[PDB]
Amino acid sequence: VDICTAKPRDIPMNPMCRRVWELSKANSRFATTFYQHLADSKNDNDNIFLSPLSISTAFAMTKLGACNDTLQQLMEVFKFDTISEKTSDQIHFFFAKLNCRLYRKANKSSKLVSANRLFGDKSLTFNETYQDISELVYGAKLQPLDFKENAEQSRAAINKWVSNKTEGRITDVIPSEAINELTVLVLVNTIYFKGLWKSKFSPENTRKELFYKADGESCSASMMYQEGKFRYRRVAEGTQVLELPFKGDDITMVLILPKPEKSLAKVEKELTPEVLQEWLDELEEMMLVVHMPRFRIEDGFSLKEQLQDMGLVDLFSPEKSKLPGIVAEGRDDLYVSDAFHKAFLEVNEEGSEAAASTAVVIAGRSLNPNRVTFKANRPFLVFIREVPLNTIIFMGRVANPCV
């Protein structure tokens, strides 16, 4: 039974505890709710970059061994309870279907790698059903590590493993000394994405240009430039929405650039899944001039603080946590010590994480003289989505791309 074959009865009942999917909707509700809270707590001159899909996946995996209020809190916070027909055992089934299509091994131009792992001290034993379904559905190993007597060796091992999965772009998922002898359970998760643009820019048309920060000042950015046929629409209150697809067309990049006058903080607060979905429905292929800067964002997270604040308390509490999928001789306080996530995105003329020099020659072209222009020389929102599945893979904000 592999992940694409798995049927509903292959994801078992629990211990005692085009078409648009229901799971994808739920994940997008988490994504905009989590993003808004994170952005509201951050200064407007800082870049944000995260993978909500990664976070959702990691915590769905973790709720296999959760129960009672711990499971209830999990289900609520990640908006899994919003999926109409109750059954919380059908979410693992939905993720099997989503993970099978997300992480294929087709020649699909883009590469999408999943790193999803729960690390427990060697004294803990993971239930056999928990291990089995985590492996099948999430491709996740419940990994024993010597935390008690080799804390730092484990941390280096954890960081080394995520490093191998991100091709050396993410080297420190766990920040220094965040793991010790008292660490019991650590959840680590990342998603790594490489892809070439469908319509690449040429480095010879890139040139230093001013970027206007939220503080009022300016800096020098490497502004890329090309002209071509892209899905676009100027929407409510002068906001420019632009989709730049990757080779294959299944993974695209959506940019949300507000007019000069309107603030990006105001757009971040208005952000909803249904406002975003109406914007995509208005987009139309159009011949336009594209100006967008080369940017590189590496944002690392320690999730407990914020997730607790949103209502995920029990899971991180020694008294309150209810995790019957994990067991330890003589211990009744098995809790998650922290959840670590780190995401990376480098965007150039070739695409996402491809650094090549593709010159471009366009012979005999003469475009409309009044064609629309898109110049991203002021903060904008970035969405990396999977079109067929209607899934927000990554999401972020480019508030300062300057060197």
Ligand SMILES: *[C@@H]1O[C@H](CO)[C@@H](O[C@@H]2O[C@H](CO)[C@@H](O[C@@H]3O[C@H](CO)[C@@H](O)[C@H](O)[C@@H]3O)[C@H](O)[C@H]2NC(C)=O)[C@H](O)[C@H]1NC(C)=O
């Ligand atoms: C980085 O992660 C990749 C996973 O894609 C690791 O590659 C895997 O490495 C193992 C060895 O550690 C390979 O297994 C080989 O199996 C044959 C079959 O018996 C055996 O004769 C070899 O001696 C070895 O055990 C495996 O093929 C390889 N690929 C996969 C898909 O698993 C890579 O090793 C990781 N980096 C480090 C430094 O570990």
Ligand SMILES: *[C@@H]1O[C@H](CO)[C@@H](O[C@@H]2O[C@H](CO)[C@@H](O)[C@H](O)[C@H]2NC(C)=O)[C@H](O)[C@H]1NC(C)=O
């Ligand atoms: C995994 O969880 C199941 C419960 O869902 C545990 O099964 C219990 O096993 C003991 C004897 O093997 C029985 O007394 C209980 O009746 C079982 N419960 C059920 C509901 O079947 C299983 O032991 C757990 N795994 C570990 C490692 O303990």
Ligand SMILES: *[C@@H]1O[C@H](CO)[C@@H](O[C@@H]2O[C@H](CO)[C@@H](O)[C@H](O)[C@H]2NC(C)=O)[C@H](O)[C@H]1NC(C)=O
């Ligand atoms: C966790 O929730 C389960 C319900 O799924 C509770 O189990 C109930 O326990 C009582 C007595 O122990 C039984 O009469 C019920 O039949 C059980 N289950 C159901 C389906 O109602 C459990 O008490 C809750 N609390 C803890 C700490 O485990």
